[PDB]
C-alpha cells in the first residue's frame, strides 16, 4: 500500500504456520503482552481482528542472534555510572539483571540523580531500587515500540487502543499525487523511508551529470558513472501508484547514502503518509455527527487528497474443441462506434478513456451449432446472418471501473512467448484512474481517529478565520474525550505553532518554561518542521508557552489565542461563532477504503451452478447475503411475504426469478413463489 506497509511487512513476527500453532489452538494467553517482549516485540502494533496477539512487529533496536532468540541493546552501568558501552542481551540474560528506565535523571558524568529509580525486574516487576543496584539501562525511550508505532507524535498521551489503530492505519495510507511531509513529526520518518527501499539513495558520492524524469546519472570522484532509473507510474501491488521523482538537479554535489530521488509517500526523504490540514474542533450542523468528517472542497479543487490507482485486466485466447479463440476487431453484431477505440488487432489503444462496459480486448469463441437455443436459431434465421458460429467473449471493463489506458502487454505463442499449453495469445491492459477525495472515503489521523467523509461543503460554507482563510477539515468534538487520544489535540496546537512560527521573549533572560527547550527552538519561522519523539519530545508546559508567543500573520494580527482557540465566522450566515474554537493543523491520511471500490449493486446476474443461488463478492457481480439473523429480523417483524420473496424468487427459484423479471418488464404483478432448488439438492443428498 505504502512503503511503511512493506517495511512493517518485512518486519512481521507471526505465531501461525507449520511448527507453530493453529488459530483454533491459541488461547488468550499466547496473544497478550509478555514482560519479556520489552524492546523485542512491539506491544502496540498488532491486528485487532482474529489474528490479535498472534502477529507482532519487531521492535526498533531489536535483532536476532544465530540461536533464534531476540536480543536488545542496553547501556552497561558499572557502579551506578552510565557508560557508553552497549551490549545486546537476550530474554533470560535480561532477567538475570535489573535495568533502569530510559528517561532516568542522569548526571553529566553518569551518576543517577535519585538513589531510588524506576527499575524493571524479572516476572515483570516495576519498583524503585538503589542506584548501586542498576546493572543496565535502556538505550532510547522508543526502544519498546515498533517503527510504525514510533511514528505517532505524542504517543504517550494516547491510550493503547487508539494507538494500535493509528499504527495499523498508517500502513493503510494511499500514496497521493503530491506528497507533503508532516509539520509535527517524530524523527522516525526519515529512516523509515530510507530503510523501506522505495526511495533512491546514492551509493557513492559524486556530482549529478544528467538528471531527467527517466533516470539520474551520478559522476563519481574516481571517474566512474552510476545511473539510477526511476520507477514511473508502476502498479504498486494493492493497486496503488509507485512513482519515483528526482530531487537533485544538474551539477549538485551529493554525498554517499543521500536521497537523490524519493518515491510514493515520501517528501525530501521522509515518510509523507498524508497532508497537513487546517482543522477546527466543533460540531457543524450535524454533518460531522459521530465520526463523520466535513472537508473543504479546496482539497478537491487543488488535488490535496487525490490519488492515482492502477488496475490490471487480463485475457487469453486459447484452443477450444471447435477451433481456437482469436483476438480480433471483428466482433459479431457490434457497431463501428463501440469498436472505435480499438486498433486493428482488437485491443484498446493507449490513452483511450474507458468507462464500465467498454471493450478492452475483442475475443470471439466458436460455438457449436448443436448448442443453440430454439429462439436463438430462429433469431439467426430471421436476420439472415450466416457464418456467425462464434460468440462474443471480449474483455470488458468491470462495473465501477473507469480510467485511461496507460499500458498494453501482448504475449503470443506465435512469437516465441512461452504460454501455458493450450493458450495462443495473452493480453494485459493497465487502466489508471485519478481518484479525487469523495463523500464516504475513509480518512484518519495518527492517533486512531478515523472517519468517513460525510459532506464536502463549498469553500465559502466553511467556517473561516479572521483573515478569511477557511478551514480545511471539521472534526466533531464529541469523539475526542471518549477515545482518550489527546495527542491529536496536542498535535493540533503544536501544528499551528509550526505553521505560524514563534519567538520566545529573550529580554530579561530565558523564561522559566523554555529552560529545558534547546536553543534551536526559541525561534521558528513559519512552516517549520519539528520532532516529538515517542515518550520524549514536547511537554505540555512548553506547548502552552509556545501558544502564547505565536508569530502574527502578514497583517500583524495573532489569529489564535494562548489557549489555542480562535474566533471563527459562519460562512453560511456571516455571524461569527459565539465562542472561540480550537484551530490548528493536523496530519490527515487517506486510507485505502474508498467508496469507488466499496459500492456495489445487483439486479440479476450469475448464479452458482450447484446451489443456483446468486454469486458472492463484488468482483463476481454477486448479491448480498440475507443471513440467518436477518431472517430472524424478518420473522420478528412478521413480514412473511417479504421473507418468502427473499428466499425464493429473488434467490434460488429457477423458474420464479425469470417469470418475476418478465412480470416486471411487462408491468404485470409479481407471480407466486415456487420451490427452492437448494431444497431439492438437500433431498438428493439425503438420498
Amino acid at each position: 500500500n505504502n512503503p511503511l506497509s512493506g517495511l512493517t511487512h518485512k518486519r512481521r513476527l507471526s505465531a501461525l504456520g507449520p511448527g507453530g500453532l493453529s488459530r483454533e489452538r491459541a488461547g488468550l494467553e499466547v496473544r497478550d503482552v509478555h514482560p519479556s517482549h520489552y524492546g523485542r516485540m512491539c506491544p502496540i502494533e498488532t491486528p485487532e481482528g482474529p489474528n490479535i496477539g498472534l502477529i507482532g512487529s519487531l521492535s526498533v533496536y531489536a535483532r536476532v542472534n544465530p540461536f533464534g532468540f531476540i536480543e536488545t541493546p542496553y547501556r552497561k552501568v558499572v557502579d551506578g555510572v552510565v557508560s557508553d558501552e552497549i551490549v545486546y542481551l537476550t530474554a533470560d540474560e535480561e532477567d538475570r539483571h535489573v535495568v533502569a528506565q530510559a528517561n532516568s535523571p542522569i548526571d553529566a558524568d553518569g551518576r543517577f540523580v535519585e538513589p531510588r529509580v524506576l527499575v524493571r525486574r524479572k516476572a515483570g516487576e516495576v519498583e524503585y531500587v538503589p542506584s548501586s543496584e542498576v546493572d543496565y539501562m535502556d538505550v532510547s525511550p522508543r526502544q519498546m515500540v515498533s517503527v510504525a508505532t514510533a511514528m505517532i507524535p505524542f504517543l504517550e498521551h494516547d491510550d493503547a487502543n487508539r494507538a494500535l489503530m493509528g499504527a495499523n492505519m498508517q500502513r493503510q495510507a494511499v500514496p497521493l499525487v503530491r506528497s507533503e511531509a508532516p509539520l509535527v513529526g517524530t524523527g522516525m520518518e526519515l529512516r523509515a523511508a530510507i530503510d523501506a527501499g522505495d526511495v533512491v539513495v546514492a551509493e557513492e558520492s559524486g556530482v549529478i551529470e544528467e538528471v531527467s524524469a527517466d533516470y539520474i546519472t551520478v559522476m563519481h570522484d574516481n571517474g566512474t558513472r552510476r545511473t539510477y532509473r526511476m520507477r514511473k507510474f508502476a502498479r504498486s501491488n494493492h493497486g496503488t501508484c509507485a512513482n519515483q521523482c528526482p530531487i537533485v538537479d544538474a551539477g549538485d554535489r551529493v554525498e554517499a547514502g543521500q536521497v537523490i530521488a524519493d518515491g510514493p509517500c515520501t517528501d525530501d526523504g521522509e515518510m509523507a503518509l498524508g497532508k497537513n490540514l487546517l482543522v477546527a474542533i466543533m460540531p457543524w450542523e450535524g454533518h460531522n455527527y459521530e465520526d463523520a468528517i466535513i472537508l473543504s472542497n479546496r482539497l478537491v479543487e487543488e488535488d490535496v487528497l487525490t490519488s492515482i490507482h492502477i488496475e490490471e485486466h487480463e485475457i487469453d485466447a486459447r484452443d477450444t474443441k471447435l477451433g481456437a479463440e482469436e483476438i480480433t476487431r471483428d466482433i459479431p453484431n457490434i457497431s463501428d462506434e463501440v469498436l472505435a477505440d480499438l486498433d486493428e488487432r482488437g485491443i484498446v489503444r493507449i490513452g483511450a478513456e474507458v468507462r464500465d462496459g467498454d471493450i478492452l480486448v475483442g475475443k470471439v469463441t466458436p460455438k457449436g451449432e448443436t448448442e443453440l437455443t430454439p429462439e436463438e436459431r430462429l433469431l439467426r434465421a430471421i436476420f439472415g446472418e450466416k457464418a456467425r458460429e462464434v460468440r462474443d467473449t471480449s474483455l470488458k471493463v468491470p462495473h465501477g471501473e473507469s480510467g485511461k489506458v496507460i499500458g498494453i502487454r501482448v504475449f503470443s505463442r506465435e512469437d516465441e512467448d512461452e504460454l501455458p499449453a493450450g493458450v495462443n495469445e495473452l493480453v494485459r491492459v493497465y487502466v489508471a484512474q485519478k481518484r479525487k477525495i469523495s463523500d464516504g472515503d475513509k480518512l484518519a489521523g495518527r492517533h486512531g481517529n478515523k472517519g468517513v467523509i460525510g459532506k464536502i461543503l463549498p469553500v465559502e460554507d466553511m467556517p473561516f478565520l479572521a483573515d478569511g482563510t477557511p478551514v480545511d477539515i471539521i472534526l466533531n468534538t464529541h469523539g475526542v474525550p471518549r477515545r482518550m487520544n489527546i495527542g491529536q489535540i496536542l498535535e493540533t496546537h503544536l501544528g499551528w505553532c509550526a505553521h505560524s512560527g514563534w519567538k520566545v521573549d529573550a529580554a530579561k533572560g530565558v523564561p522559566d518554561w523554555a529552560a529545558r527547550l534547546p536553543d534551536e527552538l526559541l525561534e521558528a519561522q513559519p512552516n517549520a518542521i519539528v520532532s516529538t519523539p515517542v515518550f520524549d519530545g514536547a511537554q505540555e508546559a512548553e506547548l502552552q508557552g509556545l501558544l502564547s508567543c505565536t508569530l502574527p500573520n502578514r497583517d500583524g494580527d495573532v489569529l489564535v489565542d494562548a489557549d489555542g482557540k480562535a474566533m471563527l465566522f459562519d460562512g453560511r450566515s456571516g455571524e461569527p461563532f459565539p465562542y472561540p474554537v480550537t484551530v490548528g493543523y493536523m496530519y490527515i491520511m487517506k486510507l485505502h477504503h474508498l467508496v469507488d471500490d466499496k459500492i456495489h449493486a445487483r439486479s440479476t446476474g450469475p448464479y452458482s451452478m450447484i446451489t443456483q443461488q446468486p454469486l458472492g463478492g463484488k468482483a463476481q457481480f454477486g448479491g448480498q447475503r440475507f443471513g440467518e439473523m436477518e431472517c430472524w429480523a424478518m420473522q420478528a417483524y412478521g413480514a412473511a411475504y417479504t421473507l418468502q420473496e427473499l428466499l425464493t424468487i429473488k434467490s434460488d427459484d429457477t423458474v420464479g426469478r425469470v417469470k418475476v423479471y418478465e412480470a416486471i418488464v411487462k408491468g404485470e404483478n409479481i407471480p407466486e413463489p415456487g420451490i427452492p432448488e437448494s431444497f431439492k439438492v438437500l433431498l438428493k443428498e439425503l438420498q
Binding site: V139, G185, V201, S531, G537
Partner: peptide
C-alpha cells in the same frame, strides 16, 4: 536537530535525552 547523518531536511527535535545508539 534530528537525524543529522544522511543529509536530510533539518527537523528540529524537542529532545531532552541524547541518543547513544543509532537505529
Amino acid at each position: 536537530s534530528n537525524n543529522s547523518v544522511p543529509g536530510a531536511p533539518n527537523r528540529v527535535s524537542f529532545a531532552k535525552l541524547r541518543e547513544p545508539l543509532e537505529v
